[PDB]
RNA sequence: CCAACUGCAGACCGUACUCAUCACCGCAUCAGGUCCCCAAGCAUAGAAUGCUCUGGUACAUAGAGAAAGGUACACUCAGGGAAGUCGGCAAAAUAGAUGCGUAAGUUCGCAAGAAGCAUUGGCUCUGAGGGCAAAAUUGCCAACUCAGAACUGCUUACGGCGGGGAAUCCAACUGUAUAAUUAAAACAUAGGUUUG
RNA sequence: UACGUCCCUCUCCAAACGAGAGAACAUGCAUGGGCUGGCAUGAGCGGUGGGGCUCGUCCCGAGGCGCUGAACCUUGAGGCCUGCAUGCUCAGGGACAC
RNA sequence: GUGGUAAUGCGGCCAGGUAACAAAUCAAUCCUCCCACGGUGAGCUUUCUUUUCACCAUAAUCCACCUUGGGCCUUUUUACCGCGUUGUUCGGAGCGGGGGCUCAAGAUUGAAAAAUGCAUUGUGAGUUCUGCGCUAAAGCAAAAACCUGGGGU
RNA sequence: CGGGGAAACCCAGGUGGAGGCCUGUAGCGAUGCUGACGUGCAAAUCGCUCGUAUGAUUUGGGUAUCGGAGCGAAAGACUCA
RNA sequence: GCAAAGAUCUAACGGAGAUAUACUCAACAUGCAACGUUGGAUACUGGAGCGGGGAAGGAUUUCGUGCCAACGGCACUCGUACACGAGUUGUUCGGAAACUGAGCACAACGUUAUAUCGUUUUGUUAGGAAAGUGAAGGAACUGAAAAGGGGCAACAGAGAACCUGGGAUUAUAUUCCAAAAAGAAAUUGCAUGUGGG
């Protein structure tokens, strides 16, 4: 509004930053519970940073540990975002059916059985 | 999306105006917006004794 | 988008059936009437009809149970004319008065 | 609608009781000339008007 | 006596449903008539017109299906262009917005959108037009409109939307007015005069 | 009794409906291929473009170029080719003659 | 009855007031729509989409007590110049500056009230009640009911 | 508010929002097709086109004036087909 | 003739409404056409609506269970039809109680062979005696002061003390809900205590 956009500035796009402290995610896999590993692979190769999907340096990393995968970013987010990614995973590995994410807490999602 | 693409200025051409220039963008609206900017300058000048009160009524005047 | 209906048995949009439109706790948009004003406590008509100072526009039940502050001030003639009224009438008894008094004396000294 | 006065609201109440049909045992009398009610009435044919 | 407190009491009639392409009037479940309130998104000047979420509906007898002749709230037509006809009836035709330009006449207000000529898409850019927080200085922020340029494209391509000019007769003008064959030059009008 | 004719079914030189011209295990019908024609270069992918954005590269961008006379359509109120390829038919049924 | 220099706090009869009344212009609150941030659920997913859709509520009645629009008080006095509106104007019959009194409409804090309802909290546009105090040879119904005072009792 | 003039006044730019003003919805009407229908949807309706649309405007309820009478911007119009 | 208002298709259930044969015969050429509910698909209305509430008018058309003779200009297993049984809840909402308006016309008087006629709000009946009780004092009675009789006419003018939630109906609800009234208020009359006087 106050400047004017343009368009070649559609290459670069700033995602805002927290003022301090890394937010933390969680997503529980027990009830389901190998996968472990494609899951992991597919968020780090999915997860867009600042535009760019797969190479996400390291302002993102990613854990798996008793069936929970964790992912800590001291980046601006949106807990959606890896609901989304999840259900865009649960689709290509033919899942859909028999399987559904619910907000737990305030942080995490769980997996869950129809 | 063509939001955007109006907001940068695309889609608002002789070609397109179909309405009368007042009735796109009425003037006493225009009017109205300037002068209260003017006299909205001249107040802030006159408390900040930038300028006295002899200068600010003949400016006052003018606008 | 939702769209309102009358509650109260009147269905016509004149000066004393105005409605306000309401959002309750059950998260429903209804009618609720809107209750009709008054002027105030006015200055007499010949005398310019000015609304005084230091009372208060009530209506009718507000008025009869309100309290008498609200409705005068402690001068005189309190709620029914003005200070500068009061004064002038004060000014011209006195100022009158002692004209009358001259003149009657004047004419008794010139009889004796 | 809603206002009608309670004489026409009692005129319209005898009319309800009157439109009925005849018992089956008043046609098993002696004597009886007696089949229909003849006097029946439908809102949507002939009006009362009051 | 004045206030609050507290106790008890708070009578009568209306209240279903409808309000209309089926509930009222028109012989009827009749394309006619009938007062009030609430009123979304996009295009656009928009309560114009076109399409859509919510709410509502698929009810108005249906099937097969190239005759002639019809009705239409449906279209096109080579060359000519009113030669048709009592008569351009009916159809066609003009068309938005912006810039330039505009005659005789005149009660000086108009005539006037007189007439007429030009531009318009898409894309990528540039300039102008403001506020509050600490000085003709620094940061942070909103809302849209106008103007200019380069590149690029047209099969002239939704809807909606004046054809124009020169004269003669009548009535000054806006208005009313034979419900069901006459809307006018008739009536009214402001202005003028007369009478009691 | 026989010869046969008509209806049901299929085709279109006929046709408002009747009537007509035909066929009745027949390249008859169906789908595909080739021809003949119509429009005008598909979806997708990729290294010239007025300009612009970030670290010699990497991206946003109408349009253009290549694959590409591509893609799609072509008998149907009924274009061609089996003197081009496959699939379906498996005792045709009824009424009169009588 | 009683405080304040004052504007004005607080505890029969007679004269006024409310009821009580046009247009236009401009501008609030309520409500509607849009946008930006988050949270919860559902949809699309050959490919693309930090994505698309829905929801995120607060009644009357009451306490305590900042904005902006009028009217006024006290103090220092205005040299035809000064104040002010989008707009047709105001001033020794008191402009402007300092400090105050009051009215109208809003805001905020809390009680109600989570014990309820369903499965957040900021911008921009539009619309009412409201305020801006009050064509014309056309100039804005009345009364009950109620309110305040002047007097006597 | 700007320019000119000795003076009377003259030329120009804004603001404002008047009018039985104009284009045009809803509303109130009814010009042409001499269209459709004309044993009709209808004992006067339908379609397109057309007049006006801040005013001598349109409309609900209440009230007041009738049969040789009433009312009428006047057509012998209207007074329950 | 039953042609304005664009339009329906599909499966599964339901139903007597069928897959209904003398046989031969696998089946087609010998039971057609049409109906309701649910799911899915495709369209229309398009906020001046085949949306949700009211007045005038109507008066049970409302709801549930059945039924399908007649009526719904074709059809029905369906109906605003037919039969049986049910449904409308108020201190505060609308009216009246209790305002005045354009207006009406009882009394009184006048007129008429005849009241079934006239006047009756420009403050205002009528040749016209239209007032019936405050305070009283010594429990009710009694009577001073007040010109201008009685009434009607507005469910859009004036007036008018209540709001949300409900898992509360087959059908009513700002009307129903019971001691934790789901609850929270406002107002009227009469009494009782407290304080002030
Ligand atoms: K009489
Ligand atoms: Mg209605
Ligand atoms: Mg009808
Ligand atoms: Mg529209
Ligand atoms: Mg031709
Ligand atoms: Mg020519
Ligand atoms: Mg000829
Ligand atoms: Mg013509
Ligand atoms: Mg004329
Ligand atoms: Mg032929
Ligand atoms: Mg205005
Ligand atoms: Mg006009
Ligand atoms: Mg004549
Ligand atoms: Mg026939
Ligand atoms: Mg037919
Ligand atoms: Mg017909
Ligand atoms: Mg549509
Ligand atoms: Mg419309
Ligand atoms: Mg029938
Ligand atoms: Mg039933
Ligand atoms: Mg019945
Ligand atoms: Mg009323
Ligand atoms: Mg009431
Ligand atoms: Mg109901
Ligand atoms: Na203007
Ligand atoms: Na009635
Ligand atoms: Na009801
Ligand atoms: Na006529
Ligand atoms: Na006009
Ligand atoms: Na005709
Ligand atoms: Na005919
Ligand atoms: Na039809
Ligand atoms: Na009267
Ligand atoms: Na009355």
Redesign the pocket.
């Known amino acids: 509004?106050?400047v004017?956009a343009?368009?070649?500035?559609?290459?670069?796009?700033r995602?805002?930053q927290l003022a301090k402290g890394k937010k933390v995610f969680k997503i529980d896999c027990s009830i389901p519970a190998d996968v472990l590993g494609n899951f992991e692979q597919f968020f780090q190769d999915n997860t867009?940073l600042?535009?760019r999907?797969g190479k996400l340096s390291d302002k993102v990393r990613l854990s798996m540990n008793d069936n929970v995968l964790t992912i800590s970013t001291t980046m601006?987010?949106?807990?959606?975002?890896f609901?989304?990614l999840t259900?865009?995973f649960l689709?290509?590995k033919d899942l859909?059916d028999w399987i559904?994410?619910?907000?737990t807490g305030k942080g995490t999602y769980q997996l869950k059985y129809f | 999306k063509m939001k955007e693409?109006?907001?940068?200025?695309?889609?608002?051409?002789?070609?397109?105006?179909?309405?009368?220039?007042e009735?796109?963008?009425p003037?006493?609206e225009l009017?109205?917006r300037?002068?209260?900017?003017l006299?909205?300058?001249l107040?802030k000048y006159?408390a900040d004794k930038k300028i006295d009160?002899?200068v600010?009524?003949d400016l006052?005047?003018?606008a | 988008?939702?769209?309102?209906?009358?509650?109260?048995?009147?269905?016509?949009?004149?000066?004393?059936?105005?409605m306000?439109?309401?959002?309750?706790?059950?998260?429903?948009?209804?009618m609720?009437?809107?209750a009709?004003?008054?002027?105030?406590?006015?200055?007499?008509?010949?005398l310019?009809?000015?609304?005084?100072?230091?009372?208060?526009?009530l209506?009718?039940?507000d008025?009869?149970?309100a309290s008498?502050?609200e409705?005068?001030?402690?001068?005189?003639?309190?709620?029914?004319l003005?200070?500068?009224q009061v004064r002038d009438r004060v000014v011209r008894a006195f100022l009158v008065e002692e004209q009358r008094i001259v003149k009657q004396a004047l004419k008794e000294h010139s009889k004796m | 609608?809603?206002?009608?006065?309670?004489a026409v609201?009692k005129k319209?109440a005898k009319?309800?009781n009157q439109?009925?049909?005849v018992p089956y045992w008043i046609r098993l009398r002696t004597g009886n000339r007696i089949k229909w009610n003849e006097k029946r009435?439908?809102?949507?044919r002939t009006?009362?008007?009051?």
């Open positions: 509004v106050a004017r343009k368009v070649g500035s559609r290459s670069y796009v995602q805002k867009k600042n535009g999907k601006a987010y949106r807990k959606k975002y609901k989304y259900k865009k689709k290509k859909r559904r994410i619910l907000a | 693409a109006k907001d940068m200025g695309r889609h608002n051409g002789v070609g397109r105006r179909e309405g009368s220039r009735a796109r963008m003037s006493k009017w109205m300037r002068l209260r900017i006299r909205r300058l107040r006159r009160r002899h600010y009524r006052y005047m003018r | 988008c939702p769209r309102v209906q009358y509650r109260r048995r009147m269905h016509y949009a004149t000066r004393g059936n105005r306000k439109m309401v959002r309750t706790p059950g998260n429903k948009l209804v609720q009437k809107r009709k004003r008054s002027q105030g406590i006015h200055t007499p008509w010949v310019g009809h000015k609304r005084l100072g230091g009372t208060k526009a209506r009718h039940i008025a009869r149970l008498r502050h409705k005068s001030v402690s001068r005189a003639y309190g709620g029914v003005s200070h500068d | 609608g809603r206002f009608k006065p309670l609201k319209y009319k309800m439109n009925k049909p009435r439908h809102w949507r009006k009362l008007n009051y």
